[PDB]
């Protein structure tokens, strides 16, 4: 915009006139010590006010040098909400496309103090879940675990080079949970979901094939009758 | 107001007199070192007190240069509550109209340290939901998922170029949740709500038609009946 | 309070003597460097201690120039608890009358770093609610929605130029919720409450006129009697 | 502790001798630059370390100048827990008598950055509550409201010049809550509680006069049986 | 420990050699400006690093001069967890014996920025509780309140000069709570507990003397029978 | 690898060359004033960057002088998670052994701003618990309290010189809780647990000896039947 | 993209010409005081902006000297979420592989202010669990505890040199909890899980061998009837 050009011209004019008066003040402007003090105060205020912008620019330069992410991939941070697919990497501001298709303008300085996670560069997608048996299938926990583990071992979509754990490890207050923890070969978010659904259906079939069943949030009641007779 | 102009003139006169005494102090005011100390202390205090206003002004300039938002679109921030429609962008503060029609005055400096989202520039509005089947019907999960996916694919208000996912991926503590995740073509908040309602009614029809039902928060009770005989 | 004056005079005298010794002590007081460093340290410590007090005054000046609120208006902030109707705006601290009829003295500095919302300046009061049908009456949602909408279209206390939405958009845990979102023409907190009550009663009448009903929080019990035979 | 009085004397002696050496160092001590930098570093360390005391003293002076509270009245802050009755106001700390009859020593600096509320200076006490009818009483809500309102218009202990609101505005999860919001004309904490109790008893009587019968959580049990034959 | 003395001697040697080189550098070395900047940077870094340690000592001096707590009384802070009995007060570290007989070493600096409560110096112990009647005995509230108030007024362990409030002021969701708020004469934690137990037993007797038994978390079931025919 | 000593030597060489150029710039380096500000800015940046590292070493020195803990002691802090058994105390980093036998490397600076508790030096271990009767055995509260108190007083593993409290002081939501609060003579975590188990079993025996019987959550229901006829 | 090298060379040129002009300005650029002011302002602003980047590099150097972790080791921090396996330690950024196989980029400065835990250097894995007996079978707690202790003492996968605790210590609101606390010899996350599953199954067998079942979330329901006849 032409008005933006006008604003830049005004800013550079103010800066350059300040520089000239400070640099050539001693020649004409008396009290070089007074000019020293005034310029020091002004510069200190300006810098301690614009430190945010300067940090943004320097963080942008750093991001450009070392690349925690590229345009295509999507990022997230446990410390702060910046999740989304990066659209543009600017000097001061980076635009990220959220998963609801909304722009998100992240100052670059934010990346100098938080740990940035890059799921776009991940190698595998993880499937984690719990079974949660019924406290009366305790005699069947071992066979259920073995069957689930064998099913996961022969699943085409499961990566056999990664960790594949199926173990009764929780012992919750209303169920005997069995952790299932594996990885898929694909990282597409549609093949992964299909594989997860298939694994879950196979798990249901395995659990119900034996005499076991999943548990609801059970209770005991100790019912008492106090209604008038 | 007259008093506002009076206050501005008083501030200007104070600035002028301090500038004059600092610049011409050496000529008449002795103690060049003492004048240095006094002026430096005063300037440091003033600047370290007004850094907030200076930051507001600089952030306003930056907002003018980089344009996260216009004067018509609505914005929000995950970090802080600034949600609303931008009413006007000032040099020091931005006036935003909240969705309950209340003015909100946001200092510009906060825009230099938070990530600003701009839903006003969004491309599509997303419909996300969960089914949560009655959990005693797991043999009907696949057919229900397929029917819902086909219904969404054939829906005229759903954008077919965006992600369209319908998958069982949960094992909820009381239900078999099926995530549904799609996008609409419109972004008007009135056609989007109508499309969402239509999709939800279609989903209800699909679920009921397949001999399934939505789940409530179930539990088991193990009745004891300790009432006195 | 003669002491108010005594302490002010004492502070003025201390400041004056410090200024005299720092400014006219260059010749009588030897060690220009020593007095320079002494005065610098003292002034720096005083400034770092009084930065908050100076910030209060500067923020008061800014509030006087830029006016987020006036005496009559009642304000609030998402970031801090300053809710109430402002009683007066001092240079250093503003006192606000809370809705308990209690005075609350808020320093001006806080207004330089928080978003100040001014509900006193609003144009409309918003009515928002949800219906939450039993989920056994999903066939009556649509009709009911329309009915409610029509009622809000004909209500004399509802502003027709503002947002007016009535839609099923939830799939709640135990009910089918219908968001109602409208604005009233008045902003007086007494006609608004009366209009809200009238709208709610009309909504009850509309819901019960059909075969629908509002839902309680339900769960499926599944009892397995284990009392001794 | 005579030794600590000697320690105080030693502290003041150290301060005075350091000042004298800094001011008389040049005459005997040499390397004006070295002495200057040593004094500067020492002063910077002392100022950065011993700043809380100066801030507390300045905040105490300010508290004396502008009086957010006096000795008798009790104060509270939404930001920090300082609730209690002011026992005495010192230069660095204030003693506040909590409602446990325990002394609480609040540094003065805290008062320079938090909003201080003075309930001791309030003009009225507020009675606020909700009714919460059964949800089978909708047809009787209106009259109920009116009745309650009338009971508050004729109550000797209710201030008629303040806001007096009685309205159905909630649509709660298990009840039809009616907000009651009024003010008493006493502020002594014993007649206020008595008036509140009287108003609550009158509200109970009014509600029972009609078939209203304040509600309970009221969940639907959606019962099923799986006990083996 | 001899090595502690060795470390102290090493620190003293480093300090003295630094002082000698910086203060007599010009007479022996050269580069007044270079030595000045080097010494300044070094001293500034050391001060920024040791500000916390210096603050500890300054806060210890203040804690001696102003005495929030003595050598035997127990303290606590709503801001920080420092609860316990003061074991000893050092120049930098204060040792407090927690109530589980475990030492706690708190830096003195913390006491300069938090409000310290000293229940060791309190005058009375407070008894506060709620009754919570069955909510079907509202006609008994007045007589029960009067009886409890008379019992408290006639109790020999209750301080009659302090506040003594017994009032129905709640409208809980499942009961009619009655606040009881009084003080005891003793403050020794063993007779206070005995008096509290006696008051509680007397309250139980008073409540059950009238047909106004206490309240449990009531509910309203609304059963739907869905068992297969 | 050699890279450690190589990097140390490189850092030493860089520091030495910087010192030489800055301190001999006076002789050959032109613009004696320019190099002064260059070195000043460089040193300010380096110190402001390494303040944390310097503070770590200073806090290590302080920890070596003042001894909150020794090698064998296991420590914990309410402010931050550092719980574990000290493994070694370094100059910058302290190595702690967690109770899950994992190393934990705590920067020494952490200990300069948090209160460190040292359970390793406890004198006694504490047993605290509550009984929780049923509201129907309120007539037995006194007798049970006396019996438990006598049992604790006669127990051989309980320290009689410490506080020994057994009192009804709660009025729980669904029970009459009796607080029990005593100390054991041992502090070894194995005899303490055995003594606690023995005390708990004796408490169960005492409670069952009378008809108290250890209340449950114990709510009320008020059944309403809406089942279709 | 050679533009990266071009921008790096531009930065080098800027930072070298600044040094050239500042160090040679005194020869040709007048106003030594003004030039010093400008240079100091620029350096101070750049330092405040790049302190974070400088701290990252210094923390990287220290992390190389002191080694909290190595490449293969997997680390975590109670303060920040940095959990994962270290991929590579850089000068400014450390790359860590999370357990969901995605990279995480942690600035080195984070390691200078948080305590880093290294379960990679862990020696033994811990098995900790709770039993929670039926809470009406307290007479069997001792026998169950002894049996479980013997089972753990005779288990070949349990380290007998570590702590091995099995004790009743809780009085849960619905159960009598037995804490079990032991260590396993292996640390491979696969034999540990197998050993934990075996121990849990043996615990179930022991608990059910002599009649004592696990507790559910019990209640005392107190049914009351208010349905119309
Ligand atoms: C902000 C302005 C950034 C301008 C360039 C900043 C440094 C250059 C980008 C980082 C890549 C780089 O060139 O690294 C060079 C070098 C990396 O270390 P090595 O020499 O390879 O070996 C260890 C010796 N200390 O130094 C650095 O840049 C790291 C320090 C960067 C501080 C900023
Ligand atoms: C003492 C505290 C500050 C008091 C002095 C200034 C009070 C505010 C003045 C009110 C008038 C005002 O701010 O006008 C807007 C003015 C900018 O005017 P423009 O012409 O639009 O921008 C051109 C810049 N190249 O804002 C400012 O300058 C803010 C100055 C920062 C201190 C306020
Ligand atoms: C407060 C000061 C307000 C105005 C400061 C002047 C800068 C405001 C931003 C104007 C736009 C801008 O400067 O961006 C251009 C420039 C592009 O980078 P270059 O290395 O110069 O070009 C190489 C591209 N191949 O970006 C910057 O340098 C931003 C500088 C902001 C510093 C403040
Ligand atoms: C702390 C150090 C001791 C306090 C020094 C000042 C104490 C406050 C003085 C009493 C209050 C007062 O009258 O002065 C308030 C004064 C404003 O006075 P006005 O005439 O209303 O503004 C006219 C500007 N157009 O504000 C201040 O200067 C307060 C400065 C305090 C920090 C020094
Ligand atoms: C840190 C080093 C501390 C060394 C001593 C610091 C001050 C001495 C402890 C305070 C003793 C004391 O008398 O406090 C009250 C006295 C108040 O001054 P008066 O002349 O008595 O009356 C009000 C006029 N200002 O001194 C103060 O506390 C105020 C200055 C304290 C700053 C420290
Ligand atoms: C940075 C490394 C600093 C190491 C030296 C710090 C002081 C020496 C270690 C502490 C031993 C010590 O003597 O502490 C007590 C002594 C305080 O004086 P006293 O001799 O106890 O009697 C009252 C006289 N005013 O020093 C201090 O603890 C305060 C100074 C610590 C500054 C750091
Ligand atoms: C910024 C980059 C800093 C790199 C250099 C940091 C120090 C060199 C690496 C550490 C090597 C080392 O082990 O030094 C230990 C040594 C510890 O003291 P000792 O000589 O062992 O005995 C006590 C004497 N007062 O020095 C230190 O590391 C502490 C100072 C480090 C400050 C950084």
Numbering used by the authors:
A (entry chain B), B (entry chain A), C (entry chain G), D (entry chain F), E (entry chain E), F (entry chain D), ...: 111 to 339
Question: What's in the article?
Answer:
The MscS-like channels are homoheptamers, with each monomer comprising a cytoplasmic domain and a transmembrane (TM) domain. YnaI’s most distinct feature is that its transmembrane domain contains five TMs instead of three for MscS.
Here we report the cryo-EM structures of the SMA2000-purified wild-type YnaI at an overall resolution of 2.4 Å. Consistent with the previously reported structures, 3D reconstruction of YnaI directly extracted from the cell membrane with SMA2000 reveals a heptamer. We could reconstruct the soluble portion for YnaI at high resolution; however, we could only resolve TM5 and TM4 of its transmembrane region. EM density for seven potential lipid molecules was found in the hydrophobic pockets defined by TMs 4–5 and the cytoplasmic region. In the E. coli inner cell membrane, phosphatidylethanolamine (PE) is the predominant lipid species, and this molecule also fits well into those densities. In our structure of YnaI solubilized in SMA2000, TM4 (MscS TM2) is shifted by about ~15° or ~2.8 Å compared to the other published structures.
